[model samples]
Target chain A: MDFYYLPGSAPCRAVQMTAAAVGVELNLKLTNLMAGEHMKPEFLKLNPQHCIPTLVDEDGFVLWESRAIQIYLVEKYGAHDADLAERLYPSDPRRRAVVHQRLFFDVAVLYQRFAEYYEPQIFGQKVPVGDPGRLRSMEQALEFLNTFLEGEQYVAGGDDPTIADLSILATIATYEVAGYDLRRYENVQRWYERTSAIVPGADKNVEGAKVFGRYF
Target chain B: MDFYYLPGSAPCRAVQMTAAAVGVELNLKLTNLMAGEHMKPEFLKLNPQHCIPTLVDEDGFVLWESRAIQIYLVEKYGAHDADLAERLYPSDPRRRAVVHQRLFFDVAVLYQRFAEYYEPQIFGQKVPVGDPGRLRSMEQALEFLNTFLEGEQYVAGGDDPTIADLSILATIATYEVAGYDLRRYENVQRWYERTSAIVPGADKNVEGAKVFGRYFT
Candidate 1:
């Protein structure tokens, strides 16, 4: 399989971490989002949205979106170990439902805040910075995370790392590099440390950081 | 099983339609968001997010989020026909992945457009009108849909109505009432009609319009 990516990008980092965690070796093709490579006609043909982290399987099937790709990998490759699938993404109706809920909160609410906050400030766009509504929503999301992590080592009720951990960690890492303080979110902080430690190639996050630094 | 809901809310209506389609009867409790009932301490204990369309199974497992709730119903109560799950929400990695992609798009992009274009105008808030960036983004989304629906009967790949169809219909209906014209996209318009016909209680969407009318007017 081939992984199209830009390291510092949230979605890209998510797919990379997921693949590494599951021991899936992917040929990484770096797309230059800063240089308009994704928007070029050739790249757009593969993914009309021109989004990063597009995975093309050896059989020529194309999958976009980070979470969907992660689910696809686990469903296809990890089905042998039912317990592994359950631990990473529970097949039980109720547990999966809760996990999806958290995933929605992360994708819709938290990731949206990151775009709203980071896009204008980092990209020199004239978009409004620090909307109170966005901040309150982010804080609410963080509070929910804090509540969920009060007693559990992981966000989704298991000691084993799931895509939820990867998704949240990647997003939070961006915020951390953007200079957000972690002292206020001790539970999230601790969880982040644990996830990064277990997640393979997590040290590459520093290399990813260089991309963002270049843009800034 | 018990379903806690408000009839006119989109997410609530989604669960209602799924229940009716799958032939499952859920004990219903209506929590009026208009009356600030969902904000009550008692209700918040059940769902901290305080959103409607919460489902409590016989075993007392509580679940929220309309799409998630719908999937749970089909898996647990509906027939175990893999084909049905595939038609509604395919198990094939590629198709299911696309379904989730559009699902997130509905929640993140299209819904955001609805809020940007209509929220302040409807609620008497002082937020600014829709900007070029938002307009462009929405049109881009519509174009994507237009391209995808070029030949297919449903939003996703299958011929039958999927969870993606239900979600896209519920979302686009609100956007249409908010003043966007459905006629512009011929494919989407036709698909919308077909989905509304097949999905149970889809006419209840008119009920949603009536509810929103009170707030917008």
Candidate 2:
């Protein structure tokens, strides 16, 4: 598979972790967003959205959206290994639905608040640095996540860290790099430490997140 | 199933449509956001997010996020009828991935743009009316959707409509009710008409969208 991504991108890192977990070899094709390389005709031909974490399978099938790509990789490749498939992305209706819910929450709620709070400063846009409203919103998102992880071992399902954990972990690493303290979110802090140690390709996530932190 | 929702909510409408498609009945419990009813302890106990379209099944499994609830309903209830299950939400990995992508796009991008653009005005915020940047962003989101639907009969997968279609349709109907014309995007216009005519519980969506449109007036 050919993976077009930047190392610093959280979504891309999430896909990388999933790829490692699924044991799929990725021919890394780095697309530098800083250089506007994503807009090139060839890249656009593969994905008109020009979003990173775009994966092209050997069969010429293209998929984007980090979470979708994660699920696809597991469903397609991990099928050969039942233990990996069940561990990463469960097939049970209820268990799978929880995973989907958490993934949606990360994109639509959790990571979104982080993006809204940090992107302007990261990109050198003129916006209030510590806008109280944005900070409170970000904290609320984190609180919701902390609450979700209150009694559970993982973010979405059981004791095993699912793709939802990888996705949220990737997003959370950026926050940590950006200097937001997770100590107050005890559950989040513990899970971050636990997940970071176990999830494959996590070292790459830390390296990439530091690169993301440099912008902040 | 006990569905906590407001009829005018797009997410709630999407769940309703999905329930219709799956042939499952929802015991509707209307929660009025404007009345501060969603803030009630009872509601919060059900969902800390206080978002609409929360579902509680007979077995006491509580779930939110309209797309997730839609999938859960179809996967659990529609399983008995194989044809309905395959038609609404495909089992094929490739086809299923497309559906997942579109669902994420609807929540994170397309509908997000809609929320960011209209929400301030809808809630009587002090932002400038029709800010150029916001309008441009909204149009770009629409253009992306239009591009995705260019040659396809449905939003995500196959010729028949999936939950993605039902979700996007619920979202698009609100835009139409808010008086944004869809004729500019030919593909979206055609698909909107085509899907609206065939999607189950569409009449309820129309009624709900009109209620949402009242905020603009």
Candidate 3:
């Protein structure tokens, strides 16, 4: 499958970890955003949104949005590896719902705050060093994640690491790379340490997060 | 199932329509955000985040995030009505992924832009009439929705409307209620008109959107 992505993008890394968990091989096609490769005509034809982490399968099924792509990968490939699928994304409606909730929380709350807090500096926008409101927003998001992780080993409180763990781990890694302290969120800190050690493609994520960190 | 929500919330209305689609009965409990009902100690115990549109099933399976609730209602109850499940949320991975993508688009892109554009005025915060960039962002979101609906009967492209249609319709109704002209996006206007007429609980959405619209000038 053709996976168009950048190494530094957290969303792309989320899909990469999911593919590793699902045992799907990916042909990485690095689309350089800095060079405007994503906006090129050919790439735009594949996804009008032109966002990376887009997957074009062997049979030509195209999908994007990292979380959606992650779910699709497991659902399409899980037949070959039932155990991993069951552990990473349980079929139980209730458990899957919690996973979906955490995914939504990651995209909308956790990652959104990260973008607001640091993207300006990362992209060379002339904003101030910091804003208290934005920082508080980031802290509030971390607090929620900490509460979710309290007395639990994973983001969704399951024995196995689900895609939610990979998704949140991708976001948390960028924070770690940017030198944001996770020590304040003790539960998040612990879960971060434990999950990163076990999830597939995590080492690759570390390299990508450092790429993001260099901008900080 | 207990549904704690405010009528005017777009996310809550999206779930209501989903429940209607899946033939699930909801025990409605009004969660008044303006009156601090969501922050009540008991409510917070139920949901640490304390957001509305929370669902507590008979088995005490507590779930929030409206899209998750919608999917859970369908997955858990679709056994009773397989036809609705297949049509609304197909089992085929590719089809289901398209629906999922649209749902995420509605939440993260469409609704996020709406909140950024108009929410301050709705909540009585002091902002100008509008920001040009914010309005452009709203227009851009509509354009994407319009593009997605092009050459398709429904949001997900099947004959029958999926949860994506109902979800986006809930959002579009608020813009209509707020008197933002929809005539500009031809595809969106047609889809909005067609979808609002046929989707279950759509009349309830209209009423709720008017409640939300009342706060606007």
Candidate 4:
């Protein structure tokens, strides 16, 4: 399988982390987003959206969107790791429903907060920095996380790493790379440390400060 | 099965239309959002998000999120309709990928545009009126839909109606209600009529005009 990737991107990190956790080998091709490689004709033929990381199976089936790619991978390859699947993303009706809820919150709300705040800052766009509306939205997202992490070790499902943990960790870590303080979120901070400790290569890949230093 | 619903809500209407199409008899309970009933303690217990279209199954399994609920219902009950799932939501790898793409577009981009523009106009919120940012976002979403609809009868997959159709219909219909002119989106306008024509009770339930009535009045 071939994976088009760029380091430090939230979605790209998600695909990479999932591949590592499942012991799946992928031929990685790094795309230079800074140099406008993704929009080139060759890359556009592979992914019209021009986003990474796009996963292409040997059959030439191409898939984009990090969450969808994760689901596809788990469904196809992680059948043996039933516990891992369940822990990361329970297929059981009730548990999966809660996971979906958190997934939506992360993708729709939290990711949006990160993009809205971070995109302008990174792109040198003549846009307002840290608008109150954006901050409030971020706080709303954090409030939801803080509320969920009140007693639990993980964010979405129960303790033990799941897809939700991977997603939330990547998102939060990206925000930290962009210089957002994690101190305000005590449980999330601890949970981040705990999750990185358990997952192989998570800490190494997620040393966001180092990864995103050029952008900063 | 009990369906907690409210007319005029896009997700609720999508579930309603899907249920009607699939012949799933849901004991309907209306949660009046206008009255703040969704935020009440009882409703909050059922769905922490306090959103409408919460489906409680025969065994009292409460499933929120309209897309997931729609898929679950068809998978479990619509087995008789061999092409039901595929037509409504194709399990084909490529097709399903497109569906997810459109779904995220609806949830993240299109829905945000509706909220930014329509909320202040209708709900008397402090959001700026006639903001170019909101207008630009709306145009971007519409341009996406238009580009997708270039050679096809539907948005994601080809001609036949899928969950993507229901989702886009409900969202676009609600946007029409929110006072965005559908005429600008000729293809979407045409597609909207096509969907409503097939799915009986969709038009009345979606309340396209009522949404605009708030702003006009």
Candidate 5:
């Protein structure tokens, strides 16, 4: 599969991790946002949204939205690891719903707040503080994460790290490098550190993450 | 199944419509936001987010997040109507991913902007407008949507309306009620009109939506 991405992007790291974990080989094509490569006619023809990581399957079908791509990669490629697949993304409606809910919480709420704070900083190359609602929203995101982790060892379900963990880890890595003192969110800090080393693409992700980290 | 919700909530309405489409019965329970019932001890114990529409399954499994609820309902309750289920929530990887992409687009971008414009207005019992950034975001969302609907009958994937269409319709209806003119996007206007009456749950939602209509006044 042809996967378009940039390393410093958390969502791009997310797709890379999903592919690595499930043994799905991705022909990684770098689309440099700095150069506006995503808006080119050829790329826009494949994905009008002009976002990565956009995946082109062997059948010539295309998909975007990182969380959706994560789900697709696991369900489509991890059939050989069905037992692992069921744990990462359970087939049971209830467990899967719990996982999906957390995934949505990440995009719609957590990462939403994270970007609100960090995007401005990324462009300016300096960390600015006290953007009214941004920090409060981050705290709320952390509160929800800590509370959810208080109940389960993993973020969403069961004993092992699911794709939900993978997705959240990608975002939280940036949240750290962007200079938020995660020390306050004890449970999240604990869970986040534990989650970093255990996954397959974690090392590849770390290299890209330092590029994100150097800003702060 | 117990569904804790309020009638005027777009997210709640989305789930009610999904349940109606799949023929699953929801034991509708009132969680009055005005009364802060969602923050009560009992509700918080079950769902820390304390949001609706929260679902309690027959076996006592608890779930929240409206899009996730829509998905769980189809996958769990639509066993009797497998063909119908697959069309509405396709099992094919690429097809399902498209549906999911639109759903994420709704939460992360479209309705995210819609809510930014309207939430404070809802609380103050007033309407205000003319924020440049908020309006720009709305236009961007609508532009992406118009391009998406350019040749398609539904918002995402196939001639038949998927859950993606339902979720988008739920939010877009609120956008209209907030007094934005949706006429600029020709394809969206056509698809919006076409989608309003085709689903099984559309009429009930429309009828009940008059209550929502009165709210914006």
Candidate 6:
């Protein structure tokens, strides 16, 4: 499969980590975000939204939206180890529902607030550096994460890590890159430490995050 | 099962329509957003987020997040006909993935942009009225919806509507509530018209939306 990506994007790093976990070799294609390469006609032809990491399967199937692609990668390829696939993404309706909820939280709350907080600053806009409301929302998101991680080894109640861990881990990694203080979030910091240690290719994520952290 | 909702919410209305599609009856309990009832001790205990449509099954499984509740209903309760379950939410990986992408679009793009555009207006904040960039974002979101609908009967490419359609349809209904001019986007308008007609309990959606439209209009 071909994984079109931008290294700094939380969603793109999410797919990379998922690939590493499930052992699917992605032909990494870097779509230059700064150059507006994603908006080019050729790229738009493949994805109407023109986002990454857009995955084109070997059978010519195309998918986008990182969480969807993460689920797809596990659903289609992780089947060789039924136990592994089930743990990463449980087929049971209730377990899967929790995973989906966390994934949605990552998209709508965690990373959404991250972009709102940092995107304007990165683009040289005159928005306030310490936007109070934005920080409060981010803290609220972290509080929810801390609550869900209570008495659990994994976010989705699995004994092992699921795609939810990878999804939120990528978001937290980006938070680190942006130089946010993690001292207040005990559960989140603990979960991040443990999850980062176990996932394959996490070093790639760490290096990419450092580059993002120091970009300013 | 208990269905906690406020009818005016796009996401809550989505769960109503999903229940209708899969033939599962939800015992509707209104959580009045206007009255701050969603933050009550009982509701907050069940869901820390305290958002609806929150569903509590007979067995005491509490679930919130409308899209999650929608899929759960179809998967756990929509077994009257297996084919119906498959059609509303296809079992095929590709088909289901497409459905999921649209659901994400609803939460992340369509409704997300909608809130950005109007939340401050409703809250009496000093955001610019009809801001050009903001309007362009709403248009861009509409354009993506139109592109996805081109040459397809449903938003997710099935011959019949899936959960994706319900999710998007609930969101589009609110665009009318917000008084966006939808006449320009033909495909989105057509799909909205068709999907609204076929889903049961749509009258509830229309009635609730009328209240929303009149509030802003």
lDDT of 4 by residue, A51-162 (tens): 7878989988888778777767776667778877666667665666566666666777788887876677667674646788778878777776876787888876576777
Put down candidate 2 lDDT per residue, B1-217, tens digits, no spaces.
Answer: 8999988789999999999988999999989787988889988888888888899999988899999999998999989999988989998889999998999999998889888888777678837655687778778878888989988999995979999999999999988887787788999989999999999999999999998898888
Model 3 chain B — which ten-residue stretch has the worst lDDT? Answer: B122-131
Q: What is every candidate's C-alpha DockQ against the true complex, given to 2 decimals? A: 0.70, 0.87, 0.87, 0.39, 0.85, 0.81
Which rank order by lDDT, best down to worst?
2, 3, 5, 6, 1, 4
Model 2 / residue A209 / CA error / Å: 0.9
Judge the docking of candidate 3 as incorrect, acceptable, medium or high: high
Task: Report the C-alpha displacement of residue A147, candidate 2, in angstroms.
Answer: 0.5
State the lDDT of candidate 5 residue by residue for B97-155, as single tens digits. Answer: 88999999999888999888777776774455465877798998999999999888998
Instruction: Tell me which of candidates 2 and 5 scores higher on lDDT.
Output: 2
Query: DockQ score for model 3, please?
Result: 0.87
Model 4 CAPRI rating: acceptable
lDDT by residue (tens digit), candidate 5, A1-216: 999998888888988998998987889899997799999999999998888889999899889999999999987898899888877898888888989999999998788988887777766545566477787877888899989998567899687888889889898888887787888988889888888868879877777877888765
Flag the better candidate by TM-score, 2 or 5. 2
Q: What share of the true interface contacts does candidate 2 keep?
A: 0.80
Name the better of 4 and 5 by lDDT. 5
Q: Give the docking tier of candidate 2.
A: high
Chain A, candidate 3, TM-score of: 0.98
Fnat for the candidates in order = 0.67, 0.80, 0.80, 0.22, 0.90, 0.71
Quality of model 4 by C-alpha lDDT: 0.74
List CA RMSD, all candidates.
2.4, 1.2, 1.2, 3.4, 1.9, 1.5
Worst 10 residues of 5 chain A by lDDT: A121-130
Question: Comparing only chain A of model 2 with the true chain A, what is the TM-score?
Answer: 0.97
Range of the 10 consecutive residues with the lowest summed lDDT in candidate 2 chain B:
B122-131
Candidate 4 deviant stretches above 4 angstroms: A79-87, A120-129, A150-153, A208-210, A213-216, B1-4, B27-29, B32-35, B56-62, B76-83, B126-131, B181-187, B208-213
Residue B195, model 6: Cα distance from true site in angstroms? 1.5
The TM-score of predicted model 5 comes to 0.95
- Alpha-carbon runs more than 4 Å astray in model 1: A80-82, A126-129, A206-210, A213-216, B79-83, B126-130, B213-217
Alpha-carbon lDDT of model 1: 0.76
Residue-wise lDDT of candidate 6 within B1-217, one digit each (tens)?
Answer: 8988877888988898888877888888988866889888988888887777899988888888888888898898886779989988998888889999999999999988988887666556736556698889999999999999999979999888998998898889999888899988999999988888888778888877776676574
